Every structure is written in C-alpha cells, then in structure tokens.
Ligand binder design. Structure first.
Ligand SMILES: *[C@@H]1O[C@H](CO)[C@@H](O[C@@H]2O[C@H](CO)[C@@H](O[C@@H]3O[C@H](CO[C@@H]4O[C@H](CO)[C@@H](O)[C@H](O)[C@@H]4O)[C@@H](O)[C@H](O[C@H]4O[C@H](CO)[C@@H](O)[C@H](O)[C@@H]4O)[C@@H]3O)[C@H](O)[C@H]2NC(C)=O)[C@H](O)[C@H]1NC(C)=O
Ligand SMILES: *[C@@H]1O[C@H](CO)[C@@H](O[C@@H]2O[C@H](CO)[C@@H](O[C@@H]3O[C@H](CO)[C@@H](O)[C@H](O[C@H]4O[C@H](CO)[C@@H](O)[C@H](O)[C@@H]4O)[C@@H]3O)[C@H](O)[C@H]2NC(C)=O)[C@H](O)[C@H]1NC(C)=O
Ligand SMILES: *[C@@H]1O[C@H](CO)[C@@H](O[C@@H]2O[C@H](CO)[C@@H](O[C@H]3O[C@H](CO)[C@@H](O)[C@H](O)[C@@H]3O)[C@H](O)[C@H]2NC(C)=O)[C@H](O)[C@H]1NC(C)=O
Ligand SMILES: O=c1ccn([C@H]2O[C@H](CO)[C@H]3OP(=O)(O)O[C@@H]32)c(=O)[nH]1
Ligand SMILES: *[C@@H]1O[C@H](CO)[C@@H](O)[C@H](O)[C@H]1NC(C)=O
Ligand SMILES: *[C@@H]1O[C@H](CO)[C@@H](O)[C@H](O)[C@H]1NC(C)=O
Length: 161
C-alpha cells in the first residue's frame, strides 16, 4: 500500500540527478508514501541529527548543496508523522530502504519520470518506484536506462496480460 520513490543519477537533469552523477551515487530515496497525507502541526520537529541518520539519502535542494535535511524534513512533515507516529520507526525504515537502494537494482523498479536522450536513443529514468505508474517525459517505443541498467519495458518485471 506504501509507495517507495527514489531519484536516479542523470547528468542530463539539472538538480539532484546531476549531483548524484558527480557524487557517483546511483539511487537516492525520495520518500515512502502511505495513502494518508499529513496536515497540520507535526507531532515532532525532525532535527538534522535525526534526519542525517538516513544514510545515503541526498536532499533535492540546491540550498544544502543536495545533502541534508530539507527533502528529509519535508517527508517527515507530509508523510511521516501522522502515519508512523514516532520518528524512530520512520528513520529506521527510511534508512533500511536507502541501504537496500545503495545495494543496486531493486526487485521492483518502475520508471516515473524520464528524460529522453537523443544521442543514446534511451529513456533515462530520473525517478522510479516499486509499483507501475503513468509515465512522464517518456518516448514510446524507446528502451529505458535506470542509472546505467538497460531495460526493455518501464519496469524490471512484466506487468501486462
Ligand atoms: C506502511 O505505512 C504504514 C504507516 O502508514 C506503516 O505503519 C506504521 O508502522 C509503524 C511501525 O513501523 C507503527 O508505529 C508504531 O505505532 C504504534 C501505535 O499504533 C497504534 O495501533 C495502530 C496500529 O495498528 C495505529 O494505526 C493507531 O493509530 C495506534 O496509534 C506506536 O505505539 C509505536 O511506538 C512504539 O514503538 C516505537 C519503536 O518501537 C517507539 O519509538 C514508541 O515510543 C512506542 O513504544 C510506533 O509509532 C504505526 O502504528 C503504523 N501506522 C499505521 C497507520 O499503520 C507500515 O508499517 C508501512 N509498511 C511498509 C511495509 O512500508
Ligand atoms: C554532463 O552535463 C554537464 C552539464 O550539462 C555537461 O556540461 C555541459 O556541457 C558542455 C561540455 O563541457 C559545456 O558546454 C560548453 O559551454 C560553453 C559555454 O558555457 C561553450 O562555450 C562551449 O562551446 C565550446 O566547446 C565545444 C567542445 O566540444 C566546441 O566544439 C565549441 O564549438 C566551443 O568552442 C561548450 O558548448 C556546458 O557549459 C555544460 N553545461 C552546463 C549547463 O553546465 C558535461 O558535458 C557532461 N559531463 C559528462 C561527464 O558527461
Ligand atoms: C531490505 O531488503 C531485505 C531483503 O529483501 C528485506 O529484509 C528481510 O530480512 C531477511 C534477511 O535476513 C530476508 O531474507 C530471508 O528470507 C526468508 C524467507 O522465508 C526468511 O525467513 C529468512 O529470515 C531469510 O534470511 C527477508 O525475505 C526480508 N523480508 C521481506 C518482508 O521481504 C527488507 O524487506 C528490505 N527493507 C526495505 C525497507 O525495503
Ligand atoms: O526527490 C525529488 C524532489 C524533487 N524533485 C523536483 O525537483 C525539481 C524542482 O524544480 C522539480 O521539477 P518536477 O519534475 O515538477 O519535480 C522535480 C525531484 O526530481 N526529486
Ligand atoms: C543506516 O544504515 C547504515 C548502512 O547503510 C548503518 O551503518 C547505519 O548506522 C544505519 N543507521 C541507523 C540504524 O540508525
Ligand atoms: C552504479 O551503477 C553503475 C553503473 O552506472 C555500476 O557499474 C556501479 O557498480 C554502481 N555504483 C554504486 C551503487 O555506487
């Protein structure tokens, strides 16, 4: 029921993706999204110390030189507090999810946002998730590149029929 989304390195994409390519990082966690989105005053103010414990997860913000902890705090505020109640279980999950992402191509990896590269003739996956979803910026008929890994379809498993 929870969507796990992450960023993948792409020099062709200004922002987090360019920074990941430079830093030799393949997959950086974006968030874990339950059905319920949090509204109102959070239960706990996520400190940088707490948020730095999610090892390997880069910030999508230029303001922190794509390090910590803007994206991280945003995630706890919008998706974390009202669903996990405590920061400790949330931190451990986010970190274990990022640990697994650092290992390599996940069991379930589906393109979310693409950036078609005319030179290589590939759909360079900028963001991916553990469930198939309507694509964005993807050219139909072209193969996919998930941080260097070439896949025929938008997912690393069969969806259809
Ligand atoms: C997918 O997403 C859901 C959230 O959307 C995750 O579910 C949460 O999981 C965490 C644990 O990983 C749970 O946190 C613990 O909640 C306890 C309170 O729960 C009450 O019972 C039900 C659960 O059936 C809730 O729905 C109620 O609202 C209640 O409030 C809470 O006591 C507990 O704290 C205890 O443990 C921690 C660490 O061990 C201590 O720090 C703490 O002080 C205390 O002893 C945790 O906060 C949470 O209940 C879940 N919430 C819901 C709504 O289901 C899934 O596990 C995610 N799964 C995947 C696979 O991504
Ligand atoms: C990864 O992406 C980065 C960012 O997009 C990328 O750098 C960009 O590409 C090029 C290649 O170095 C840079 O382009 C140069 O930019 C200056 C103006 O800023 C122009 O004057 C340059 O023109 C000369 O260079 C050519 C070299 O082949 C000549 O043939 C040409 O006629 C000129 O004399 C040139 O276009 C560019 O500035 C950056 N862009 C940004 C937005 O930073 C880099 O190539 C990629 N790295 C890897 C490892 O793939
Ligand atoms: C991160 O990746 C892990 C691997 O997918 C997974 O952790 C869980 O723990 C064990 C490792 O000890 C996996 O392997 C085990 O498989 C059998 C299955 O019958 C277990 O009985 C054994 O203990 C064995 O070593 C588990 O399969 C695995 N659990 C699940 C539910 O898939 C985590 O799920 C990953 N965490 C995140 C947050 O993505
Ligand atoms: O984890 C993240 C967080 C944010 N962005 C966003 O970064 C730029 C910000 O302009 C956004 O444009 P966009 O396609 O609407 O969403 C992009 C990511 O790509 N990954
Ligand atoms: C997060 O995972 C790393 C491995 O990537 C581990 O060494 C680290 O201390 C973890 N943080 C915790 C458990 O808070
Ligand atoms: C990342 O994928 C590259 C291909 O871009 C692979 O060769 C490498 O071992 C991985 N490096 C990481 C996860 O740091």
């Amino acid at each position: 029921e929870n969507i796990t989304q992450w960023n993948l390195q792409d020099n062709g994409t200004e922002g987090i993706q360019r920074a990941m390519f430079q830093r030799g990082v393949n997959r950086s966690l974006h968030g874990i999204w339950p059905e319920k989105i949090c509204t109102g005053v959070p239960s706990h103010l996520a400190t940088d110390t707490e948020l730095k414990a999610i090892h390997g997860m880069m910030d999508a913000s230029e303001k922190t030189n794509y390090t910590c902890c803007r994206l991280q705090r945003h995630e706890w505020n919008k998706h974390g507090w009202c669903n996990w109640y405590n920061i400790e279980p949330w931190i451990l999950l986010m970190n274990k999810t990022q640990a697994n992402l650092t290992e390599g191509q996940p069991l379930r990896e589906c393109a979310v946002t693409c950036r078609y590269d005319r030179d290589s003739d590939l759909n360079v996956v900028t963001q991916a998730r553990d469930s198939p979803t309507p694509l964005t910026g993807c050219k139909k008929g072209k193969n996919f590149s998930f941080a260097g890994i070439l896949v025929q379809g938008p997912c690393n498993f069969e969806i259809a029929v």
